[PDB]
Amino acid sequence: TCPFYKKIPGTGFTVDAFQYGVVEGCTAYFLTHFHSDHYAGLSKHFTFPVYCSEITGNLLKNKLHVQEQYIHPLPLDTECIVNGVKVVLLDANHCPGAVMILFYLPNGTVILHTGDFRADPSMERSLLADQKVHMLYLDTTYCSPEYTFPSQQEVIRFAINTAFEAVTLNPHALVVCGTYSIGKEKVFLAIADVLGSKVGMSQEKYKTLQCLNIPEINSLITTDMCSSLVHLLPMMQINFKGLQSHLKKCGGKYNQILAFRPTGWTHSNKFTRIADVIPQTKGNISIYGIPYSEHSSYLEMKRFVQWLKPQKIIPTVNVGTWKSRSTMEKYFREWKLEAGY
Numbered sequence: 001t002c003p004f005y006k007k008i009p010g011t012g013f014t015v016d017a018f019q020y021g022v023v024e025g026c027t028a029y030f031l032t033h034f035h036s037d038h039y040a041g042l043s044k045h046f047t048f049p050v051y052c053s054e055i056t057g058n059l060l061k062n063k064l065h066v067q068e069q070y071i072h073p074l075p076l077d078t079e080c081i082v083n084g085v086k087v088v089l090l091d092a093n094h095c096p097g098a099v100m101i102l103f104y105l106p107n108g109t110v111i112l113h114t115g116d117f118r119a120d121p122s123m124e125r126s127l128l129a130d131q132k133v134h135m136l137y138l139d140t141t142y143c144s145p146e147y148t149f150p151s152q153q154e155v156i157r158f159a160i161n162t163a164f165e166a167v168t169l170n171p172h173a174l175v176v177c178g179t180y181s182i183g184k185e186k187v188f189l190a191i192a193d194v195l196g197s198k199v200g201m202s203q204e205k206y207k208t209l210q211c212l213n214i215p216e217i218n219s220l221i222t223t224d225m226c227s228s229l230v231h232l233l234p235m236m237q238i239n240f241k242g243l244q245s246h247l248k249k250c251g252g253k254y255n256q257i258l259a260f261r262p263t264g265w266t267h268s269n270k271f272t273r274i275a276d277v278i279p280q281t282k283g284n285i286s287i288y289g290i291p292y293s294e295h296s297s298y299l300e301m302k303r304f305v306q307w308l309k310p311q312k313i314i315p316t317v318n319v320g321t322w323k324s325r326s327t328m329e330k331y332f333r334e335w336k337l338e339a340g341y
């Protein structure tokens with residue numbers, strides 16, 4: 001049974017609610033993005049209308065095989081009528097294809113569902129500038145002040161400079177980057193661009209990247225691993241054993257691996273600057289954990305919410321414990337008293 005925070009009151013709509021069977025009263029199922037916790041339940045046998053971005057729709061058709069007649073792609077930044085209700089999709093600054101959804105209810109209430117997002121000051125000049133929001137369904141993944149991390153631009157600067165130095169010192173080093181979902185593609189694209197290389201990967205991952213409308217993608221990626229000195233591997237293989245095993249397969253072309261594990265936040269963020277990050281090393285293998293986030297930091301979240309001034313907040317993450325729910329409600333009230341709404 002579908003929880004309350006995935007239903008949109010006054011509508012036949014749900015958000016990210018595919019794992020509950022047929023939801024009673026649902027006439028349109030929205031999907032904010034192609035991450036498995038959110039699409040859980042969708043398959044080629046699904047027979048109700050799915051509303052989403054174009055990129056999400058490419059992935060539903062090619063990777064999950066949902067049939068075309070049930071896929072309803074909408075453009076961004078454009079007023080659309082769905083089943084008698086005006087909606088707008090906005091870029092969520094999460095992974096490729098990820099959206100926020102603005103719903104203009106028939107009674108005059110305006111609802112913003114963030115999906116998963118990384119808040120940014122540029123969102124203060126979208127279609128959100130123009131009108132009031134009564135209810136905010138908020139991605140609260142990092143809603144506590146201990147969650148700090150650098151900008152994505154600082155993190156990419158660190159990765160490009162680390163990879164360029166290592167391969168200029170040793171032209172026989174291979175670079176490997178871990179992945180387990182869409183998102184964070186700038187990590188491996190920026191490193192391969194500084195090295196003058198295409199990125200090599202499996203046929204399954206190439207297929208996924210081919211759905212993402214990345215400009216000039218055919219110039220940037222390949223399934224010919226031998227031609228490439230940046231390889232993608234599943235995240236589970238980014239350890240000393242998996243990397244040894246991979247270097248054997250490369251036929252004596254390389255004598256060193258430098259590897260990257262993009263994570264979200266880790267507790268080593270509470271002590272270390274990005275500049276000061278060091279790897280784990282065994283022999284001719286080094287592994288860097290880099291804090292590349294596609295979710296809001298505490299401070300980015302608080303800025304967004306203090307600007308929007310919603311009348312009510314419904315969290316969508318960390319909702320399963322009383323202590324998490326109480327902690328989040330406290331910070332919502334501080335923010336509201338501090339800014340005066």
Ligand code: NI
Binds near residue numbers: 033035094
């Ligand atoms: Ni996500």
